[PDB]
Amino acid sequence: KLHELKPAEGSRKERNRVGRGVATGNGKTSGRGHKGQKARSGGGVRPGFEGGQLPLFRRLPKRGFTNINRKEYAIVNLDQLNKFEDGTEVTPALLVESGVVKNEKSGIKILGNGSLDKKLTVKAHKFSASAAEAIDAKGGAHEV
Amino acid sequence: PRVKGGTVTRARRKKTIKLAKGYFGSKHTLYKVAKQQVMKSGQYAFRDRRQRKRDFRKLWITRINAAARQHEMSYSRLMNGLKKAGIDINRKMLSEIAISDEKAFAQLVTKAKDAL
Amino acid sequence: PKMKTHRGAAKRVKRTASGQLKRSRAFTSHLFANKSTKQKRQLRKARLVSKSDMKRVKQLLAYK
Amino acid sequence: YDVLKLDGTKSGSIELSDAVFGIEPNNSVLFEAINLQRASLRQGTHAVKNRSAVSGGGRKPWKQKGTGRARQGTIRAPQWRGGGIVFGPTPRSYAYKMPKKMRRLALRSALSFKAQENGLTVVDAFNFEAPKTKEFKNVLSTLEQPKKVLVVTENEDVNVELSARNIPGVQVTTAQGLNVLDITNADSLVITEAAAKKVEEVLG
RNA sequence: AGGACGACAUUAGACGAAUCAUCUGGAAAGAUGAAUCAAAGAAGGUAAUAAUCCUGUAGUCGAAAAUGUUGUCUCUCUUGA
RNA sequence: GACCGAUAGUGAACCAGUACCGUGAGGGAAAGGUGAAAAGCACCCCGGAAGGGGAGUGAAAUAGAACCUGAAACCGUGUGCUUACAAGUAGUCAGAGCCCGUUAAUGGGUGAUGGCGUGCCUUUUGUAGAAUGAACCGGCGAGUUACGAUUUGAUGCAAGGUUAAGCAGUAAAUGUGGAGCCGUAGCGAAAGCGAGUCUGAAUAGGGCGUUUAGUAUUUGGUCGUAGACCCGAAACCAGGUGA
RNA sequence: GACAAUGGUAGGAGAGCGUUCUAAGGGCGUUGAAGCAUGAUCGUAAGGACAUGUGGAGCGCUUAGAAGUGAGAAUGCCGGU
Ligand SMILES: [Mg+2]
Ligand SMILES: [Mg+2]
């Protein structure tokens, strides 16, 4: 009932309060050590700062650019098309709605990693070279 | 919620002062002075449980030594024979025999000289 | 506030498919007559940011 | 789902249960959908001053070197008698979400603890013309119901819930207004037949 | 760009159900007994801890008047492709 | 109201920005409680009066306006043991002699004589240190919360997980809301190619990959932006008040 | 039931007592609560009761939650001596 509640076994935990004793360990110096910079209130230096020596990222050269346009295609293997059972046409108004492709960026590419094991009418924006052969083995179609 | 400092600084600073009654002057009244005498009176007692066991042996050996010299024997000739003549078990707290019954302590001295 | 990516390090570094970074070798700017042909050729392949220096830059590259 | 009652009675005893009243209840979810509800009722209006909110205290109190007593900076500091509170309460908020597969498992572990314990009772649709609590206390006495019951009805009629407000223990919630803290607060559950088909149509 | 006739809201206010007797006490609201009201068991006070003693709450009820919010009634004004 | 309860919460529960400090701008505290009802002590007695002690009111004045409970420091009066030939961080362990009698257990107070024994923190290669700090007693007085990041523990589903703002709902924690995000496929500076790809005349050889578990909320650790454990400067700038 | 381990400052890990507050179940209280005072008691430690005195109305226990959660020192701050 409600007058007797137990948490999940191993789920909960106490928390360390520092500076509140001498035999709890974290006491009279709170787990920082003696004097220095990083035992001051708010000390500790910024990350990736070696100390005055020039850092890692000012010792390597820059490399590359963007290509502002940059098409991106969504991947469907051939192993993911055994989910469609009975002679089904594979349409972008169907290949999204089941749950194979979620939230595509541009048109669907059909790569070849698995096998179809079923004849299928397949329409896709770009096939690959090895996946437009295992469709032709079972007997299928194409459209770009 | 504001946890006010309640009645735990009463009680924690009584059960140190009440351990420290019988001390001179201010070492039984003030907190800070009777605190740090309680930390030393449980430290002196810790090396005085270990020292008590070996300073009652510096007394039993003194009585046995003042018992064999009137029978004209040393102490070091007495706890030699009683390991070697007999297998009289090593005991020095039982120098109570020499105090109580001198007639009882005499036959041991007979048995020590007998096989040494 | 949410953490800002160190922009001077995202220009120099890619992210691979095991978490480990990728960089380009130094000394590739000038003075190529003071370097051997067995040395100017092997400052060209790319390597990985070391196990030591990955301990320092865990927070600065969080959205890569 | 035992049989039925009207006031000492029986009828067509509905039995078509589902995974709503029968699943073995986990307690790791049922403990953690109470804390999500019990720690969201707190409004958290509580605050305190800091060093920058107290009135005054900008002049240095003339104590730097050459006075023989301690170095002091303001007369409003946490050492000092007056204001300045270091790490006090702030006006914050206490709520968190949880997955929708884990908020539906909770009611399948609080209804499921009522039929293991015979703490469920289905009645027919009772009609009160005018609300009278004296008319309603004659009902729960002969129904043999405990000190604290949860009355489930389908839709909030304006004559059922107006009775049984001053009966200590009795709360009247509609079918889609069920909680988790309510069900583990009751002792036996009383559902109408028109609503036992309704809370089960939501979940099973 | 210049008015009336009553609807509703605000600033006073009214009604508003039901507990009696003993024990300890300086005192009953307390424990032990019997009763009751409940669209009312929120809260405060009363010689201690009151659903039934008081002020009240759920609910109804109320404007001589002065503002305020809108309905339709005027009243001003107007050519449409 | 899982906010405070008179050193708290407003500076202020008391007739507070008021006593008081400053030429001036400006700075700024201290204060609460008789009892259910004033029934607030008629009259006698010592006193110049205060203040007392009886008698009286009251449940109680051992609640009398120094007015609820009344801690410690510090000053007193009484009494069982003890001390005027001794060199004491004041205790400890061994122990005669004396006066007592508890939460009943191999008890309590006191201490002639013997052994050992140079206080507590903080900073140090190292403190009895003649290095630092505290007169004493009492209160107050320092790793906190937010929005992100990453790892660990739990739990729900699992090639799939999950919603954000919003709208309905008791400042209800629960129904709708799939915009969005992370995964399922990497590689290259980029075109691109894709279980492979880039460098290269050349898979010839090497770089990073491939034959699998993720995701959403939360317990703890730590890191980042915020004053970020608390206390303390010399000084910089902006309006203003003063010969 | 054998054989084993157990000095420790910086620091890492584990396991617990206590304080104010809230929710739920049960309970003591004017035939006297909290608080304070004395005592020769109980647990491996922080800490828990109980027995007379003063006190005059509110408080503990079991499981879980949340912290303004623990004082011997800062030439610390106000009050007393
Ligand atoms: Mg000296
Ligand atoms: Mg002049």
mmCIF file of C-alpha atoms (C1' of nucleotides) in Angstrom, chain F:
data_model
loop_
_atom_site.group_PDB
_atom_site.id
_atom_site.type_symbol
_atom_site.label_atom_id
_atom_site.label_comp_id
_atom_site.label_asym_id
_atom_site.label_seq_id
_atom_site.Cartn_x
_atom_site.Cartn_y
_atom_site.Cartn_z
ATOM 1 C "C1'" G F 1 2.658 27.358 0.647
ATOM 2 C "C1'" A F 2 6.926 19.490 2.266
ATOM 3 C "C1'" C F 3 8.211 29.094 3.138
ATOM 4 C "C1'" C F 4 10.289 32.001 8.296
ATOM 5 C "C1'" G F 5 8.737 31.701 13.766
ATOM 6 C "C1'" A F 6 11.881 37.407 17.519
ATOM 7 C "C1'" U F 7 20.396 37.027 16.268
ATOM 8 C "C1'" A F 8 14.931 34.250 12.117
ATOM 9 C "C1'" G F 9 11.395 36.664 7.929
ATOM 10 C "C1'" U F 10 11.325 43.278 5.589
ATOM 11 C "C1'" G F 11 16.067 47.801 7.867
ATOM 12 C "C1'" A F 12 11.032 47.844 10.769
ATOM 13 C "C1'" A F 13 5.566 42.446 14.638
ATOM 14 C "C1'" C F 14 7.549 47.558 19.894
ATOM 15 C "C1'" C F 15 3.814 54.839 17.050
ATOM 16 C "C1'" A F 16 10.920 52.992 11.971
ATOM 17 C "C1'" G F 17 13.868 55.251 8.137
ATOM 18 C "C1'" U F 18 12.493 56.749 14.538
ATOM 19 C "C1'" A F 19 16.483 57.581 18.897
ATOM 20 C "C1'" C F 20 21.687 58.658 17.403
ATOM 21 C "C1'" C F 21 26.212 59.950 14.260
ATOM 22 C "C1'" G F 22 27.445 63.981 9.794
ATOM 23 C "C1'" U F 23 28.208 71.139 7.969
ATOM 24 C "C1'" G F 24 26.295 68.145 3.535
ATOM 25 C "C1'" A F 25 24.852 64.071 0.132
ATOM 26 C "C1'" G F 26 24.430 60.064 3.130
ATOM 27 C "C1'" G F 27 24.869 56.069 7.105
ATOM 28 C "C1'" G F 28 21.253 53.531 11.080
ATOM 29 C "C1'" A F 29 20.526 49.882 15.124
ATOM 30 C "C1'" A F 30 17.943 48.523 19.598
ATOM 31 C "C1'" A F 31 12.654 46.475 21.142
ATOM 32 C "C1'" G F 32 7.800 41.054 21.696
ATOM 33 C "C1'" G F 33 4.790 36.990 25.956
ATOM 34 C "C1'" U F 34 1.010 38.244 33.831
ATOM 35 C "C1'" G F 35 -3.678 35.317 34.065
ATOM 36 C "C1'" A F 36 -8.944 31.746 31.468
ATOM 37 C "C1'" A F 37 -10.814 36.756 33.857
ATOM 38 C "C1'" A F 38 -7.159 42.512 36.601
ATOM 39 C "C1'" A F 39 -10.146 39.483 40.360
ATOM 40 C "C1'" G F 40 -2.806 44.469 39.745
ATOM 41 C "C1'" C F 41 -1.818 42.489 46.600
ATOM 42 C "C1'" A F 42 -7.882 45.569 51.464
ATOM 43 C "C1'" C F 43 -5.900 45.783 56.772
ATOM 44 C "C1'" C F 44 -1.704 45.063 60.718
ATOM 45 C "C1'" C F 45 3.691 45.368 61.381
ATOM 46 C "C1'" C F 46 9.950 47.259 60.729
ATOM 47 C "C1'" G F 47 10.999 51.707 57.447
ATOM 48 C "C1'" G F 48 12.046 58.793 56.129
ATOM 49 C "C1'" A F 49 10.984 56.046 51.672
ATOM 50 C "C1'" A F 50 12.449 51.995 48.660
ATOM 51 C "C1'" G F 51 12.242 46.883 49.508
ATOM 52 C "C1'" G F 52 10.318 43.328 52.574
ATOM 53 C "C1'" G F 53 6.651 39.173 56.004
ATOM 54 C "C1'" G F 54 2.387 37.952 57.151
ATOM 55 C "C1'" A F 55 -2.956 38.011 55.940
ATOM 56 C "C1'" G F 56 -5.849 37.937 51.340
ATOM 57 C "C1'" U F 57 -7.504 37.266 45.294
ATOM 58 C "C1'" G F 58 -5.871 32.836 42.036
ATOM 59 C "C1'" A F 59 -5.730 26.284 39.496
ATOM 60 C "C1'" A F 60 -0.209 28.033 40.824
ATOM 61 C "C1'" A F 61 2.485 34.575 42.956
ATOM 62 C "C1'" U F 62 8.602 29.135 44.443
ATOM 63 C "C1'" A F 63 3.032 33.578 37.308
ATOM 64 C "C1'" G F 64 3.603 40.457 41.516
ATOM 65 C "C1'" A F 65 4.346 44.682 35.712
ATOM 66 C "C1'" A F 66 12.992 43.331 37.243
ATOM 67 C "C1'" C F 67 5.833 39.619 35.257
ATOM 68 C "C1'" C F 68 5.667 31.863 30.471
ATOM 69 C "C1'" U F 69 9.719 27.790 30.570
ATOM 70 C "C1'" G F 70 14.781 29.682 32.930
ATOM 71 C "C1'" A F 71 20.743 26.553 30.185
ATOM 72 C "C1'" A F 72 26.022 27.682 30.723
ATOM 73 C "C1'" A F 73 30.012 31.266 32.072
ATOM 74 C "C1'" C F 74 30.722 34.176 36.614
ATOM 75 C "C1'" C F 75 29.844 35.796 42.240
ATOM 76 C "C1'" G F 76 27.924 33.530 46.875
ATOM 77 C "C1'" U F 77 26.431 30.676 51.815
ATOM 78 C "C1'" G F 78 26.517 25.795 53.926
ATOM 79 C "C1'" U F 79 28.877 20.598 54.827
ATOM 80 C "C1'" G F 80 31.268 14.156 54.268
ATOM 81 C "C1'" C F 81 36.893 13.104 52.668
ATOM 82 C "C1'" U F 82 41.373 15.912 52.409
ATOM 83 C "C1'" U F 83 46.130 19.420 52.545
ATOM 84 C "C1'" A F 84 51.329 23.962 56.143
ATOM 85 C "C1'" C F 85 59.188 19.503 54.214
ATOM 86 C "C1'" A F 86 57.016 20.162 49.035
ATOM 87 C "C1'" A F 87 59.663 20.906 42.223
ATOM 88 C "C1'" G F 88 53.219 19.603 39.797
ATOM 89 C "C1'" U F 89 50.424 20.151 30.641
ATOM 90 C "C1'" A F 90 47.307 18.683 36.605
ATOM 91 C "C1'" G F 91 45.720 13.317 34.037
ATOM 92 C "C1'" U F 92 46.355 7.976 34.120
ATOM 93 C "C1'" C F 93 47.228 2.767 36.131
ATOM 94 C "C1'" A F 94 48.455 -0.014 41.157
ATOM 95 C "C1'" G F 95 46.462 1.275 46.047
ATOM 96 C "C1'" A F 96 45.839 1.680 52.236
ATOM 97 C "C1'" G F 97 42.558 4.685 55.714
ATOM 98 C "C1'" C F 98 37.867 7.204 56.232
ATOM 99 C "C1'" C F 99 32.395 8.596 55.490
ATOM 100 C "C1'" C F 100 28.072 6.585 52.649
ATOM 101 C "C1'" G F 101 23.969 3.097 50.226
ATOM 102 C "C1'" U F 102 22.151 2.944 43.534
ATOM 103 C "C1'" U F 103 18.540 1.710 37.416
ATOM 104 C "C1'" A F 104 21.799 -4.272 41.883
ATOM 105 C "C1'" A F 105 26.617 -4.879 39.685
ATOM 106 C "C1'" U F 106 32.116 -8.709 41.016
ATOM 107 C "C1'" G F 107 28.832 -0.707 43.371
ATOM 108 C "C1'" G F 108 29.532 5.343 44.649
ATOM 109 C "C1'" G F 109 32.426 9.845 46.821
ATOM 110 C "C1'" U F 110 37.296 11.208 48.630
ATOM 111 C "C1'" G F 111 43.006 10.067 47.731
ATOM 112 C "C1'" A F 112 48.497 9.215 52.240
ATOM 113 C "C1'" U F 113 52.249 6.828 48.805
ATOM 114 C "C1'" G F 114 54.646 4.330 43.839
ATOM 115 C "C1'" G F 115 55.399 3.829 38.028
ATOM 116 C "C1'" C F 116 54.790 6.134 33.290
ATOM 117 C "C1'" G F 117 53.479 11.322 31.132
ATOM 118 C "C1'" U F 118 56.802 18.334 27.702
ATOM 119 C "C1'" G F 119 48.306 21.214 26.039
ATOM 120 C "C1'" C F 120 44.772 21.636 21.169
ATOM 121 C "C1'" C F 121 44.490 23.342 15.859
ATOM 122 C "C1'" U F 122 46.888 25.539 11.430
ATOM 123 C "C1'" U F 123 51.307 25.435 8.230
ATOM 124 C "C1'" U F 124 55.975 22.272 7.834
ATOM 125 C "C1'" U F 125 61.895 18.171 5.513
ATOM 126 C "C1'" G F 126 60.613 18.937 11.312
ATOM 127 C "C1'" U F 127 56.537 22.359 16.630
ATOM 128 C "C1'" A F 128 56.341 21.502 24.078
ATOM 129 C "C1'" G F 129 57.995 25.147 20.763
ATOM 130 C "C1'" A F 130 60.305 31.224 22.820
ATOM 131 C "C1'" A F 131 56.293 30.203 14.976
ATOM 132 C "C1'" U F 132 50.156 31.510 13.949
ATOM 133 C "C1'" G F 133 45.037 31.819 16.241
ATOM 134 C "C1'" A F 134 41.201 31.775 20.748
ATOM 135 C "C1'" A F 135 39.686 35.565 27.870
ATOM 136 C "C1'" C F 136 35.531 32.426 29.041
ATOM 137 C "C1'" C F 137 30.109 30.548 28.136
ATOM 138 C "C1'" G F 138 25.836 30.889 24.679
ATOM 139 C "C1'" G F 139 23.502 31.612 19.668
ATOM 140 C "C1'" C F 140 24.565 32.726 14.330
ATOM 141 C "C1'" G F 141 28.575 31.272 10.687
ATOM 142 C "C1'" A F 142 30.984 27.902 4.307
ATOM 143 C "C1'" G F 143 30.688 22.490 -2.157
ATOM 144 C "C1'" U F 144 24.155 25.193 -3.183
ATOM 145 C "C1'" U F 145 20.339 25.532 -7.305
ATOM 146 C "C1'" A F 146 19.421 26.123 -12.560
ATOM 147 C "C1'" C F 147 20.023 24.777 -18.147
ATOM 148 C "C1'" G F 148 23.591 21.628 -20.865
ATOM 149 C "C1'" A F 149 27.787 17.576 -21.223
ATOM 150 C "C1'" U F 150 29.704 12.686 -20.209
ATOM 151 C "C1'" U F 151 30.141 8.035 -17.582
ATOM 152 C "C1'" U F 152 27.795 4.551 -13.795
ATOM 153 C "C1'" G F 153 23.183 2.176 -11.206
ATOM 154 C "C1'" A F 154 17.921 1.288 -12.070
ATOM 155 C "C1'" U F 155 13.595 0.635 -15.278
ATOM 156 C "C1'" G F 156 10.120 0.606 -19.859
ATOM 157 C "C1'" C F 157 10.118 -1.135 -24.518
ATOM 158 C "C1'" A F 158 13.813 -2.948 -28.394
ATOM 159 C "C1'" A F 159 15.292 -2.190 -35.335
ATOM 160 C "C1'" G F 160 13.110 0.740 -33.578
ATOM 161 C "C1'" G F 161 12.749 4.597 -28.773
ATOM 162 C "C1'" U F 162 10.594 9.455 -27.765
ATOM 163 C "C1'" U F 163 8.025 13.881 -27.778
ATOM 164 C "C1'" A F 164 8.528 20.175 -27.654
ATOM 165 C "C1'" A F 165 5.392 24.532 -27.528
ATOM 166 C "C1'" G F 166 0.278 24.426 -27.444
ATOM 167 C "C1'" C F 167 -5.302 23.090 -26.308
ATOM 168 C "C1'" A F 168 -8.683 20.543 -22.525
ATOM 169 C "C1'" G F 169 -7.779 19.436 -16.773
ATOM 170 C "C1'" U F 170 -8.463 20.998 -9.248
ATOM 171 C "C1'" A F 171 -1.470 26.271 -9.546
ATOM 172 C "C1'" A F 172 -4.879 18.535 -11.366
ATOM 173 C "C1'" A F 173 0.314 14.882 -13.813
ATOM 174 C "C1'" U F 174 -2.467 12.521 -18.092
ATOM 175 C "C1'" G F 175 -5.365 12.538 -22.508
ATOM 176 C "C1'" U F 176 -4.247 14.455 -27.185
ATOM 177 C "C1'" G F 177 0.106 16.931 -29.890
ATOM 178 C "C1'" G F 178 5.120 13.043 -34.583
ATOM 179 C "C1'" A F 179 7.131 19.843 -36.257
ATOM 180 C "C1'" G F 180 11.757 17.603 -34.154
ATOM 181 C "C1'" C F 181 15.916 14.611 -32.290
ATOM 182 C "C1'" C F 182 19.235 10.058 -31.673
ATOM 183 C "C1'" G F 183 19.906 5.283 -33.713
ATOM 184 C "C1'" U F 184 19.560 1.323 -38.308
ATOM 185 C "C1'" A F 185 26.233 2.531 -42.969
ATOM 186 C "C1'" G F 186 30.435 3.973 -43.308
ATOM 187 C "C1'" C F 187 34.410 6.827 -46.555
ATOM 188 C "C1'" G F 188 36.535 11.612 -48.710
ATOM 189 C "C1'" A F 189 38.857 18.443 -48.314
ATOM 190 C "C1'" A F 190 34.688 18.059 -52.065
ATOM 191 C "C1'" A F 191 32.177 16.059 -56.596
ATOM 192 C "C1'" G F 192 30.681 11.516 -54.927
ATOM 193 C "C1'" C F 193 30.758 6.205 -54.309
ATOM 194 C "C1'" G F 194 28.419 2.793 -50.857
ATOM 195 C "C1'" A F 195 29.907 -3.198 -47.072
ATOM 196 C "C1'" G F 196 32.959 -0.547 -48.820
ATOM 197 C "C1'" U F 197 35.822 3.809 -49.586
ATOM 198 C "C1'" C F 198 39.878 7.508 -50.068
ATOM 199 C "C1'" U F 199 45.280 8.174 -51.687
ATOM 200 C "C1'" G F 200 47.340 5.943 -56.384
ATOM 201 C "C1'" A F 201 48.751 4.844 -63.397
ATOM 202 C "C1'" A F 202 47.403 0.084 -60.332
ATOM 203 C "C1'" U F 203 43.293 -3.672 -53.948
ATOM 204 C "C1'" A F 204 49.401 -3.920 -55.609
ATOM 205 C "C1'" G F 205 50.212 -2.216 -50.415
ATOM 206 C "C1'" G F 206 48.440 0.630 -46.346
ATOM 207 C "C1'" G F 207 44.382 4.717 -43.345
ATOM 208 C "C1'" C F 208 39.492 4.502 -41.335
ATOM 209 C "C1'" G F 209 35.542 0.707 -41.492
ATOM 210 C "C1'" U F 210 32.261 -4.274 -41.949
ATOM 211 C "C1'" U F 211 29.669 -8.988 -39.456
ATOM 212 C "C1'" U F 212 25.566 -5.546 -34.743
ATOM 213 C "C1'" A F 213 22.076 -2.369 -29.559
ATOM 214 C "C1'" G F 214 20.074 1.442 -29.171
ATOM 215 C "C1'" U F 215 17.042 5.026 -27.070
ATOM 216 C "C1'" A F 216 13.645 8.030 -23.176
ATOM 217 C "C1'" U F 217 13.166 9.544 -17.992
ATOM 218 C "C1'" U F 218 15.598 9.339 -13.303
ATOM 219 C "C1'" U F 219 19.902 7.838 -8.198
ATOM 220 C "C1'" G F 220 25.281 9.132 -7.388
ATOM 221 C "C1'" G F 221 30.199 11.041 -9.290
ATOM 222 C "C1'" U F 222 32.605 14.855 -11.920
ATOM 223 C "C1'" C F 223 33.353 18.832 -16.015
ATOM 224 C "C1'" G F 224 31.179 23.704 -18.645
ATOM 225 C "C1'" U F 225 28.295 28.979 -18.446
ATOM 226 C "C1'" A F 226 26.550 31.489 -14.498
ATOM 227 C "C1'" G F 227 29.495 35.558 -7.965
ATOM 228 C "C1'" A F 228 30.029 28.857 -7.971
ATOM 229 C "C1'" C F 229 33.059 26.750 -1.007
ATOM 230 C "C1'" C F 230 33.071 31.025 2.306
ATOM 231 C "C1'" C F 231 35.812 35.786 4.389
ATOM 232 C "C1'" G F 232 39.634 40.089 2.987
ATOM 233 C "C1'" A F 233 42.379 44.168 -0.543
ATOM 234 C "C1'" A F 234 45.764 48.593 -2.658
ATOM 235 C "C1'" A F 235 42.806 50.528 -7.038
ATOM 236 C "C1'" C F 236 39.732 51.819 -11.767
ATOM 237 C "C1'" C F 237 34.989 54.464 -13.775
ATOM 238 C "C1'" A F 238 29.875 56.966 -13.508
ATOM 239 C "C1'" G F 239 26.307 60.766 -11.135
ATOM 240 C "C1'" G F 240 26.448 63.899 -6.776
ATOM 241 C "C1'" U F 241 27.734 66.654 -2.020
ATOM 242 C "C1'" G F 242 31.183 69.967 0.398
ATOM 243 C "C1'" A F 243 35.846 76.692 1.003
#
